[PDB]
Amino acid sequence: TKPFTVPILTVEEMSNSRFPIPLEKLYTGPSSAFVVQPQNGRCTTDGVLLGTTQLSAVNICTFRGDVTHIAGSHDYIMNLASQNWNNYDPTEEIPAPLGTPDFVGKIQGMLTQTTREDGSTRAHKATVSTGSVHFTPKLGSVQYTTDTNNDLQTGQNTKFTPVGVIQDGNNHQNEPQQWVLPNYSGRTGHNVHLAPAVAPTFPGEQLLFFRSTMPGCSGYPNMNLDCLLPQEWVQHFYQEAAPAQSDVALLRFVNPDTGRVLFECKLHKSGYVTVAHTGPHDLVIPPNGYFRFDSWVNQFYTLAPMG
Amino acid sequence: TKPFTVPILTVEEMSNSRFPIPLEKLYTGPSSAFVVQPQNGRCTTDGVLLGTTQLSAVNICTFRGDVTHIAGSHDYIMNLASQNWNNYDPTEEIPAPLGTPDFVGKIQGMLTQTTREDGSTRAHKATVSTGSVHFTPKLGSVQYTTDTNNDLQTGQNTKFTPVGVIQDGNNHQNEPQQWVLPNYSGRTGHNVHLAPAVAPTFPGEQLLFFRSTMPGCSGYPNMNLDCLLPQEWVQHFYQEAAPAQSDVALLRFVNPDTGRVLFECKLHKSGYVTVAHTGPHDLVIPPNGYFRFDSWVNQFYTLAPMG
Numbered sequence: 001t002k003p004f005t006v007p008i009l010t011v012e013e014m015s016n017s018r019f020p021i022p023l024e025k026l027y028t029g030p031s032s033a034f035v036v037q038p039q040n041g042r043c044t045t046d047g048v049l050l051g052t053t054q055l056s057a058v059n060i061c062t063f064r065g066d067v068t069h070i071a072g073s074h075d076y077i078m079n080l081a082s083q084n085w086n087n088y089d090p091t092e093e094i095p096a097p098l099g100t101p102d103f104v105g106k107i108q109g110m111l112t113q114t115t116r117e118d119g120s121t122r123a124h125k126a127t128v129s130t131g132s133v134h135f136t137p138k139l140g141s142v143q144y145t146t147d148t149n150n151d152l153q154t155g156q157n158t159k160f161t162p163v164g165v166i167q168d169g170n171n172h173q174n175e176p177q178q179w180v181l182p183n184y185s186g187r188t189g190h191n192v193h194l195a196p197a198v199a200p201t202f203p204g205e206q207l208l209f210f211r212s213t214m215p216g217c218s219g220y221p222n223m224n225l226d227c228l229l230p231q232e233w234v235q236h237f238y239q240e241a242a243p244a245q246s247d248v249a250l251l252r253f254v255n256p257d258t259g260r261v262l263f264e265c266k267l268h269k270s271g272y273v274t275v276a277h278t279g280p281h282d283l284v285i286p287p288n289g290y291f292r293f294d295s296w297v298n299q300f301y302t303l304a305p306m307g
Numbered sequence: 308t309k310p311f312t313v314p315i316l317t318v319e320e321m322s323n324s325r326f327p328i329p330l331e332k333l334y335t336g337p338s339s340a341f342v343v344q345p346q347n348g349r350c351t352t353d354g355v356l357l358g359t360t361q362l363s364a365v366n367i368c369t370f371r372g373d374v375t376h377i378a379g380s381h382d383y384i385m386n387l388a389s390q391n392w393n394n395y396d397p398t399e400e401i402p403a404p405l406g407t408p409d410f411v412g413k414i415q416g417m418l419t420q421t422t423r424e425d426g427s428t429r430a431h432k433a434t435v436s437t438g439s440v441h442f443t444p445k446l447g448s449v450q451y452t453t454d455t456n457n458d459l460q461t462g463q464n465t466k467f468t469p470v471g472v473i474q475d476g477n478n479h480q481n482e483p484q485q486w487v488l489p490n491y492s493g494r495t496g497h498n499v500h501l502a503p504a505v506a507p508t509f510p511g512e513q514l515l516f517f518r519s520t521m522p523g524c525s526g527y528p529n530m531n532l533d534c535l536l537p538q539e540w541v542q543h544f545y546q547e548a549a550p551a552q553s554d555v556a557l558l559r560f561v562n563p564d565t566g567r568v569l570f571e572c573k574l575h576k577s578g579y580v581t582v583a584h585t586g587p588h589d590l591v592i593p594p595n596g597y598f599r600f601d602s603w604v605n606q607f608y609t610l611a612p613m614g
């Protein structure tokens with residue numbers, strides 16, 4: 001049978017699958033207080049993409065289409081196009097366009113546009129509030145609060161490039177909320193075709209998150225962003241499409257220098273990782289370490305307690 | 308021997324290796340008038356990274372470090388850190404930090420910063436002119452023309468996220484110049500440890516470029532950006548590290564729908580692709596097509612003329 005494997009990449013060599021920035025560290029902690037149901041960075045070890053997960057790390061949280069001004073303000077509405085600038089098909093059995101942001105927050109970036117007639121271009125600071133009723137990606141439209149008006153033509157391809165997140169008012173780090181999904185259709189209807197929610201079932205285990213720090217653009221935003229799988233694991237499983245001979249793949253985080261194993265963890269075929277530990281812990285790892293697939297085990301396997 | 312392969316990805320599913328944006332099309336054209344020596348997106352089919360090439364598609368043209376204002380202006384100097392925020396080591400035998408931009412142009416983006424003390428964050432529009440004498444990545448410092456002053460503390464981790472390119476004055480599309488390398492050490496010294504220059508040697512052949520359109524942020528900039536290898540081919544070869552049984556791998560671009568071959572091309576072990584054709588041509592390809600490795604051939608192999 002086609003042998004299953006995980007890429008030979010260190011945490012630092014990989015990318016966050018929920019925002020286009022690199023991974024930074026490994027974090028584990030209880031998650032019973034939240035609803036862990038991210039839509040980006042979801043894929044079976046089998047290579048089956050779930051939720052809004054697509055293959056490009058650079059296309060996460062980006063939007064394309066044309067815009068129309070909202071006279072009397074600095075806001076604009078973007079009628080979404082498919083990532084390759086074609087018509088957007090709402091009919092697809094997906095929660096929203098692949099790559100759409102999967103958390104409630106205010107993403108700040110820039111809108112860039114080119115007038116097809118003369119090669120005339122322009123850019124403007126922009127922010128998208130995914131919790132806004134006007135955040136309707138699934139219906140094909142999103143709204144941005146801009147730094148201007150006047151300069152942004154209609155019927156012209158416009159792109160939004162994400163940079164980071166902002167935060168307002170007291171009660172610091174109150175937003176964004178990485179674990180609260182936005183309403184892809186807004187008020188028009190509930191979310192559909194979602195990747196299931198995730199939770200560690202086996203006693204004594206906690207989810208292992210692949211963490212990054214989204215850049216802050218204003219205020220005191222909660223910049224922690226945890227994904228369940230590095231973007232290159234998604235890309236790799238999709239390429240390999242190796243059959244799961246069990247529902248849990250045993251992985252060992254090894255140090256290529258000392259040649260020794262630091263800890264071991266469970267890679268669930270559904271596409272998420274758990275470790276044996278209780279409490280919030282920032283994993284201390286040798287920069288050159290990487291994950292290695294050792295073997296398929298049953299779901300009743302008890303992992304050696306993580307460091 | 309470990310069998311060589313190329314990923315099963317369509318052009319649209321892949322990323323440009325010279326700017327963090329997705330690929331868009333395939334372009335071929337004469338290149339004798341220029342010096343094709345890009346430093347990003349360079350890797351042997353063997354898996355040996357060359358030039359300033361690193362594995363993350365999202366880390367291309369990004370910079371990290373801290374800044375100090377240039378009193379009397381809206382400009383700032385950033386003392387560069389390594390991508391993981393550690394000290395930058397100029398001693399490495401590389402042209403510049405991995406991922407540094409490899410063309411002369413004005414890249415516009417945003418600088419983002421967080422005050423480690425309170426979780427205070429801020430962002431500002433910024434532009435880096437790689438042709439500027441102050442563009443000294445190799446020495447560990449770069450300079451940005453900002454939209455402000457006052458708001459940007461020192462001794463605080465600051466990041467630059469690229470968005471697109473700008474252009475000034477008449478003579479439209481005069482800049483940027485994707486084929487002119489910047490001086491990583493500025494005036495202090497010539498470039499070093501460069502990936503070699505590339506040129507089609509075999510008669511009747513032209514380089515095959517993997518093209519994207521960088522977003523324009525002002526003026527009439529030349530937005531064409533050609534890389535020699537998609538970023539995922541770099542990532543793939545690096546993973547596989549398959550030995551080259553010859554110096555040229557024969558590839559066929561196939562349509563998974565019709566099951567038929569569109570054209571064939573040469574993937575040089577040095578890391579670049581050539582096709583049999585003369586003149587500028589935007590390749591017309593079925594959106595689902597992808598490259599497939601068929602076999603190693605000698606360097607005297609004559610390719611069937613590209614469509």
Ligand SMILES: CC(=O)N[C@H]1C(O[C@@H]2[C@@H](O)[C@@H](CO)O[C@@H](O)[C@@H]2O[C@@H]2O[C@@H](C)[C@@H](O)[C@@H](O)[C@@H]2O)O[C@H](CO)[C@H](O)[C@@H]1O
Nearest residue numbers: 168169217218219220422426427428429430455457458459
């Ligand atoms: C956009 C702007 O005006 N920036 C100024 C500035 O402004 C800020 C504004 O967004 C108000 C709204 O209530 O909130 C402040 O928090 C925000 O400042 C930003 O966040 C704080 C936490 C710090 O990180 C600031 O450095 C950051 O800009 O005022 C400051 C000085 O008072 C600057 O002029 C800044 O460019």
Ligand SMILES: CC(=O)N[C@H]1C(O[C@@H]2[C@@H](O)[C@@H](CO)O[C@@H](O)[C@@H]2O[C@@H]2O[C@@H](C)[C@@H](O)[C@@H](O)[C@@H]2O)O[C@H](CO)[C@H](O)[C@@H]1O
Nearest residue numbers: 115119120121122123148150151152475476524525526527
């Ligand atoms: C930054 C700014 O002031 N933007 C304005 C604007 O300004 C432009 C400025 O950068 C001058 C400098 O000589 O060059 C212009 O080219 C640039 O305009 C920009 O490029 C042109 C080719 C068009 O694509 C413009 O839409 C684009 O902004 O003036 C315009 C109206 O005159 C707007 O107010 C814009 O926000």
